[PDB]
Amino acid sequence: AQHDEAQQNAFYQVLNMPNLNADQRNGFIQSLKDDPSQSANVLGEAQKLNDSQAPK
Numbered sequence: 001a002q003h004d005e006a007q008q009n010a011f012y013q014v015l016n017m018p019n020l021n022a023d024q025r026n027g028f029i030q031s032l033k034d035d036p037s038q039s040a041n042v043l044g045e046a047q048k049l050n051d052s053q054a055p056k
Contacts, residue, residue, distance in 0.1 A: 010039045014046045019053035 005012050014020070014028050025046070032042045 010043045013043055017046060017050040019050045019055075020046065024049060 001012070011029055011032060014025050014032070017025060020028075028042050028046045028049075032039060035042075
């Protein structure tokens with residue numbers, strides 16, 4: 001967190017999602033690392049995956 005987090009913002013956001021479990025968030029992060037161009041895509045799908053798993 002306490003660094004130039006603005007650069008690695010997508011990765012940081014995927015970590016900082018309450019409803020994602022380890023396997024999910026880490027899996028998506030590795031997908032992002034594997035395919036840098038799909039940053040916005042992976043981030044969007046991570047937020048969707050989090051949202052669907054919201055207790056409400």
